[PDB]
Amino acid sequence: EGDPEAGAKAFNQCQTCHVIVDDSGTTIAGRNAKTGPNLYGVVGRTAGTQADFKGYGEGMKEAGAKGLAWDEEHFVQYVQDPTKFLKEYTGDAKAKGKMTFKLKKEADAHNIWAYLQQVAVRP
Numbered sequence: 001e002g003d004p005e006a007g008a009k010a011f012n013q014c015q016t017c018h019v020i021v022d023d024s025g026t027t028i029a030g031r032n033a034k035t036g037p038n039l040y041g042v043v044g045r046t047a048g049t050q051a052d053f054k055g056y057g058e059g060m061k062e063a064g065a066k067g068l069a070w071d072e073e074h075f076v077q078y079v080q081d082p083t084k085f086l087k088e089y090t091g092d093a094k095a096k097g098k099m100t101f102k103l104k105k106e107a108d109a110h111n112i113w114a115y116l117q118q119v120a121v122r123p
């Protein structure tokens, strides 16, 4: 279990590419980055299915087609090394992630998740 407060601060790194904008258009976190998908509603979301994002890689779509819904266990392994995670999960030797960024600290991964659990759950 992470700490939502430390998570919100560490989310600053993710803001270079991601935003968290709700369904009414309110910006919860971030500026205007569109390199990565909107993370609002990511908790429990089938991987690679945010309807507005058109930049998903084959590995990510394939992972969601094989039953990956984001929960803490997979999220933590994923942000630490996206490509390695995609290959393991899919069993596809050619899978590779578009997210070139890698989170270097494990404690941060849990913190950011606690923060997402707070502000990114769609009812």
Ligand code: HEC
Pocket: 011, 013, 014, 015, 016, 017, 018, 035, 036, 037, 042, 046, 047, 048, 049, 050, 055, 056, 057, 058, 059, 060, 070, 075, 079, 096, 097, 098, 099, 100, 101, 103, 112
């Ligand atoms: C730009 C260089 C990025 C940074 C910095 C971070 N992310 Fe990212 N993310 C980016 C892309 C281009 C993608 C698509 C990946 C693909 O292979 O298709 C993603 C995706 C995610 C996901 C998947 C969500 C989904 O809709 O299925 C997650 C959960 C995610 N990113 C989280 C995340 C976090 C928490 C970051 C900060 C530590 C982070 N990303 C940074 C691009 C970039």
